[PDB]
Design a protein around this ligand. Sequence first.
Ligand SMILES: *C(=O)[C@]1([C@@H](O)[C@@H]2C=CCCC2)NC(=O)[C@@H]2CCO[C@@]21C
Lengths: 229, 191, 230, 234, 230, 235, 225, 239, 204
Amino acid sequence: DSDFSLTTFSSGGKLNQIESALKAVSLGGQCVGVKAKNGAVIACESKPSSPLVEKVTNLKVQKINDNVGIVYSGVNTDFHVILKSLRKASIKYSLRLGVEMPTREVVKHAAHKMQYYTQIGGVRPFGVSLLIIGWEELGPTLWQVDPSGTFWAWKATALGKRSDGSRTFLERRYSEDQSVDDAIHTAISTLKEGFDGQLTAELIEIGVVDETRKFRTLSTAEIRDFLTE
Amino acid sequence: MLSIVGLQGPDWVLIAADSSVSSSIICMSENYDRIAQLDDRHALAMSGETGDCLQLSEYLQGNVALYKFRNGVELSSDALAHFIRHTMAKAVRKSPYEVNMLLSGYDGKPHLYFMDYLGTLQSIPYGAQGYCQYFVMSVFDKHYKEGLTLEDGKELMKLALNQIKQRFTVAPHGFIVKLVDKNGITKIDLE
Amino acid sequence: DYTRSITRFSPDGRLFQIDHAHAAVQRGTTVVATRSKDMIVIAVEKTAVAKLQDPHFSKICSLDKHVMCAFAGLHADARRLIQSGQRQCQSHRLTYEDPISIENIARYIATLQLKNTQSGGARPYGVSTLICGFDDMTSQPHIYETLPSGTYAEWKARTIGRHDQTVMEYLEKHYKDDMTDEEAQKLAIGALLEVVENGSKNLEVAYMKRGGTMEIMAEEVLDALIESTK
Amino acid sequence: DRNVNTFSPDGRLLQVEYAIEAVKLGSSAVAILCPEGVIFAVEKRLSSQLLIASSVEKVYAIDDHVGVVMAGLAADGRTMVEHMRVEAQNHRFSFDEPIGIKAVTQSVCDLALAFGEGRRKQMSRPFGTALLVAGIENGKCHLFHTDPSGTYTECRARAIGGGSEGAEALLRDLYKDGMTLHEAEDLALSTLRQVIQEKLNENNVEVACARVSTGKFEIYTSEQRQEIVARLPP
Amino acid sequence: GSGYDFNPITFSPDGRQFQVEYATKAVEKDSLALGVKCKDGILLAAEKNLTSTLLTPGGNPRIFWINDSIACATIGHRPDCYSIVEQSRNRAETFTSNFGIKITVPQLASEVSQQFHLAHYYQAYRPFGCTVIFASYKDDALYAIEPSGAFYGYFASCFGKNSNLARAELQKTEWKNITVREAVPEVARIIKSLHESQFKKWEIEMFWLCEETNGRPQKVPEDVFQSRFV
Amino acid sequence: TYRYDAGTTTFSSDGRILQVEYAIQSINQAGTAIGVQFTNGVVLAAEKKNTGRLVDYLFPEKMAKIDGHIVTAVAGLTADANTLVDLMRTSAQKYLKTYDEQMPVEQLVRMVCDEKHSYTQYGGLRPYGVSFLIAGYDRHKGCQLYLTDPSGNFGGWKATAIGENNQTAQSILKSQYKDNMTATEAMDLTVKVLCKTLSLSADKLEFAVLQFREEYGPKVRILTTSEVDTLMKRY
Amino acid sequence: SKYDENATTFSPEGRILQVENAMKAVQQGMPTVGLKSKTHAVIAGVMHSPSEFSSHQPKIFKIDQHIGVAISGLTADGRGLCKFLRNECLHHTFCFGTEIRVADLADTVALQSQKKTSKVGKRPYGVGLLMIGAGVDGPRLFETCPSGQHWEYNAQAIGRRAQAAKTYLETNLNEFPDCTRDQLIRHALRALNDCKSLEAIALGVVGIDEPFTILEGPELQKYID
Amino acid sequence: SSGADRYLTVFSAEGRLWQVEYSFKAVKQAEVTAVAVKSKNAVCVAVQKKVSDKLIDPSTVTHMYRITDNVGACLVGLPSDVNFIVMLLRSFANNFEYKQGFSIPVSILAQMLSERHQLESQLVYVRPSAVSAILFGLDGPSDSFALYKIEPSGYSNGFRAVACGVKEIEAMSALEKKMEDFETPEATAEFTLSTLQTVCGVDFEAQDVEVSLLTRDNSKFSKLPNDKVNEILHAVAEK
Amino acid sequence: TTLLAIQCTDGVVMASDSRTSSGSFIPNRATNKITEIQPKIFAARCGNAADTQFLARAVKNYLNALNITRENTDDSTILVASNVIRSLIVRYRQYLSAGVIVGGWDSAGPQVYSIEVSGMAIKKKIASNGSGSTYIQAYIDQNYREDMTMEEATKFAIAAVTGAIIRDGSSGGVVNIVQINADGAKRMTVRPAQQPFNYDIVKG
Ligand SMILES: *C(=O)[C@]1([C@@H](O)[C@@H]2C=CCCC2)NC(=O)[C@@H]2CCO[C@@]21C
């Protein structure tokens, strides 16, 4: 019987397992998200285990539905499980309601699942923080979902390796009036800031929601086109 | 096919029910109180098998008391009516309660609800479950006036029950009539 | 499901979890249940911020039209006990059509607490309950005290919660064998006042008359009785 | 250790021994068997005079013929006597006869040691109550003793509770196989009075007889308890 | 040393499964049982160091029937040994129910190693402190499952105390070149050479699955080889 | 087993569930949430946990709607708050389906507190480290404001606070709270108490105003960022 | 000591210390003796009397017509095992219509005890059973252990002071196969007498044709000599 | 509840799943190295077959398993965990073929194994299965070869060339420093065996290595008989 | 439906018709009633089409399950396929009106098992099933020889299934032949033009 909760409040009201999962996020690979006026962007420094890895097989930037996309930082497998659950929730939402699950609905479902795993017994919290981009009625939206299941809404943020420096960089070099191309440039520059050595289009994955309100992963050609400029 | 008849007035509800309980061809009792006082404010006339009516009445009365005790508030007549409707809607699909009811309640306003085993809930000025409706609805239509006095209401309910007695082949040997008003549910005799 | 046998025996033979539930009770507000030939009275002291909260959250509850119930201890464990007791009163009506015996419902509450002491993965109720009421099947008012251990005992006048020993001493001293209803009211009120330095604005007093429901004492009659006792 | 169903290096169930200790912390109770009947004399601990003595009844009538007195945790004993009552009525229903004293004793004992922890959904700890089960079966009074370990033994005389060891020592040279029910009541009340810390009184004692002549387990009224306490040598 | 040895599913910082290693220690404590594949059949011989002279001669089996074609030598924790024997019988019966044919020692060993592995893979289970050598002539298979759940087919398997020396001695013979009846003296000599002097009374529980047995498991008859020794 | 169990549903030597006390401490480390009852409504205010130059204050974080007549401010773990808000919404809509009536505020508070208590008494799971200021209206008891705890204990409050400097906010309310106040007066009171206890950027604050009108009924409006900014700039 | 946590925990030496504690709990039971002749099997034991005026707790139990078990250890666990064994005999007399073999009962009880020792949250039965059966398998004696194993014996002693009984059985081991029912019962009673610290000794005797029967107190007087 | 971060699969104060890393070291405990190379025309997986005692029937000492006819799996790790993973990958494949109606792709099988290893790394009552899995085969929908590695963490990737076992770091380094777009299946096999031999630092014989060379011709999984393995080894000993 | 599996000396010839019938309507006129369970194990299907296709897919699942714990995947596979067909039919006898002749080649050689709609599995050298098999029972008895090779049995099975196609309305279309030897399975389709007989055999 392991039905007891391994995530429990400490003497001071600090969920030690939540902080541990957040530390796992902090050592899970830097991923940036930038909310532009006419869209949002989520990129990540997806440096493979080796040059022999095939990138497409473990893309960190993924589709949840036609309108919503997700990047993560943390345990890759936890992200894959949450991604399968979010895609299943989106297709269920489409079955019940005929439309792709809204961006904030996707974020709230991811948050609910993560909170569930922070409360039920026999499990650990998901060691990933998710940057989910998608369009709501009032415009594009970027959402951080932490292992605790608490979800921020951000104009821009990084939440992976050296994410404090990258968040200071975003605080210093972000403006709302940025377009989707400007947002992609900002995300790439943030990744460059927090990455050792020259950044390459191979080593980062970018997924954008634009005026079309549809999430699309930029091919390596497009990412290189952005990097060259 | 038991005759329960409800008549809603401006500030009262006269709920009458067949007082003759039966087993097969035998009239076991001539004063069986088919009207269930779920609350001090609500009397639920029930037409159906005596066992189904008794069990449903006890369940509803227990749930009303449990709502009154769990929360320091009594159910309204609309809230109770829709709770009964929810119970019947659950039952019909799975384990149906074969009871057609008239819920008469006074919670500061008179209320009379036509409820059936399926779960059709309708606030009515007057109504009946059983075959008696086929005999009493017209008399109500013919003789009901808005603002009817309680004495005129008793006269009209007496007329409806007399029509049940005279024209319905299975004439109930008697009726139990209850006045549901600001003073609660009081059993009355219409003569 | 989770079954960690929260309640286990200690080497000295004590259920430490029951001791801790009793401690939780003893940090609860004082309750004083007294009885007369025909009327029972319950007086719970209330700690509250009079200028910023509603005093309508009562420790005294009505399990049924004949079963009155007060508690000392965790308000949530008490809410669960009261909810289950009300469900049981209505289920006893469903199964028997007779009002549940005060001994029966007190036994049920004590058995709920006991099952929490016996069920794995279940925390003993940190609540001691005063199940009072009237039985027509016995023609006797009853006041049972169910403990977190799951033991229930009928009392002529019992108190629970904080200051329970002082109020018990007051009850023992000022108890009459054949009190009138107003004498029971005076005993309960004075016993609660012995530890409370405030009048009607603090105390909460309810009562149940023979063949009657639970009536909460007004803030005018309660104050009059408080002054009369003093 | 740290789990309820753990064996000490001495080969003892630690929770079982601790429940035995809990029984040793309970009120005293002396069961004296004699050919006329089995007599329970039980210390009713009254923390106050306001405590209704009849409500802290340590004696429970399992059936018309069989009864039980508890020592230890009154709530665990309530569970045990509830199980015994259900078993006695089920036996009457299934076999049209009173349940044997040994049979109901064995049933409650089987219930006693069914405690467990660590498995998905049962009681979580042994009953902290020892019962003195006694009753009339086939025109004979049978007295049995159940302890938290789940073992039951037929007894001519037994003691459970705080004074259990001292009561047994006093019963050593005081109990005989041919005593009359009068003498059995006298011995039970004397042993209890000796092993309690308060003067014996009809209100702080509970006496009950599984009487062969009546074939029934009755609980004595205040008048009968006075009729016994009056005869005692003190 | 460190705390990684209490939970079976816990991995030591060196990747060691300490509970599995202790189950293997339990296997190594037990008297050696071995199996050899031979021309005419497979011979399973279990050394039984009789703790008491009162033990039934020829009783307390270590070789067990699993199927009308499969026998099972057992080493280690005898409770776990017979638990795995009965689980192998149940797995063979379930295999017949699902597929109609009789199970083979390779896939029987896989199915039982599944339970072996589940023991130390999911919490709430104890790793089986037993090594089970499944032999079947009709499958020409001698698969030994270890406490971890690692199962290998052997030409000559052996586990228990002095198992390394027993395997070294089994290595000296090309067992498939000879039949079971001439393998019995060789294996008996091996175990007698490795038999420890401290155990005065003991037995060699030999079984064989051969053409002479029509592929059915059968204890080596006493006339062929008196299993009992002093 | 149970070596690494925290005894979440176990009592302490003092008699208090240490996981509920740690949850209460976690709430005391969370953004202040204040509720104030006025004549025909209740104003809830809260401090957002996520407050940065980059954080996009798109939707309420500490404020949630349970039904057309019930809104909740929360102090503590926002994730547990979202879970219990989903449960409260489902319970209120269940009561509406069953009775065709809006769920009484005290019964929804009792439902969320039964959930939170069940997590403190059964299942060995972590308690809900959230304190709800459940404002709402029901015909039975008018407009009400309830303060829930991780223990599952709730109490009606004329005005109360939770979170960081909850005692300071409670003292300020006690010194300043009046009865039968207007919506504007109560909202200004909440602004004053927040400003004293809590920086102070309008976008860092959330406001919701339950208001019962005999004509429209019980209407819950969680003030938008523009409304919160306009309301705070007036102090 | 530190590994004596659960029946599921192996000590670094391969020992289940909780299993060993249950085995000791069996070794703390009253002296139990079992014997086996070619025609009859016997289980005897000095029943325990917790108090002077308490009766001796029954120790010999009749599982089936030709099967009986003598418990040593927690008598409540012994009764639970007796219930399980009687259910197994009733499901073998239901499925097959004949009496189960005591060897099969030993297998089943060993399996149950092992499942108690292999899954967490369960304790090994604190009772060891001397089971004697008679049937197509002949008379057979099995000492079932808490660990989940049964040892077949021609004779055996368990519980307290069982070394003297074991020594007696070893001395007379070769006599038992030809010993008659009366002589096997006499050997049982004279192996228990060496353990004496009769009305305490209860003895269940079974034969290939004789159904299992329990003799206690004066009924055994004829077998003392 | 503190202290479970090292004994159970929950994050430590530094945010690491210590049990996962220890399952990686348990994979290292297999005393065996696997090297898989994928080319446009074939995928060759060679894993050293170290039989400690020759009393063991070598045909049972296998780290290469038939999940499906098209999908093979070279599993390096604890032998019990390896057998559990062969039975769990075969169960995945059968369930997938029963539902979707076609043989499971290597990518989907890798995803399912990663999901299982994530349930192991999250469910604290489940041990992380200490098996580094090299799944390989010819995917029909793309008619191209797939080569995935799933680590005990569940970290699954597609590889042009991958390695597992004791020399995983050195083998991967040699692979990346010498990977080529080979034009023949036998050049892929030669590179596979040469890298494995070099990193293991010992000369190989067919007895000492299991090699499966799935070509466009022989797409179905099968461990190469000793003849072909010896031929490839001689080709690797040429230069 | 006409099913005719012949266990030859050198293989198994599974002949079938290609006519799925919904009353007097033929929804599918080119039906593959012989399903490839494994490369050398095929299941000729008669009775309810849905039940037989479920049976084929479930037996594929069961035979893959047989291979979860074993490496001799081509051992006793046909017998196990027949056993699982039989256990699914008896388990679902109320809901599955399916008869299956499973034939092929495995380690045991060529095999042909006829599991009836009742769920009776019989290893048969010559097995036939379906409505059309009735019309050709005597023809088979007169023209079937135990010593027929896979080519002789293929010709005879084409002739018999063609006769059944001619005389049965439920049986028609092309003669789906499957020839399973040790090397593998060869599918053939005998179209009505290439069928040895025609409707003209009726009335001479
Ligand atoms: C044949 O059995 C038949 C076909 O539908 C057949 C079913 C199994 C394989 C696919 C096609 N089943 C039927 O229900 C009709 C009536 C008799 O033969 C059929 C054509």
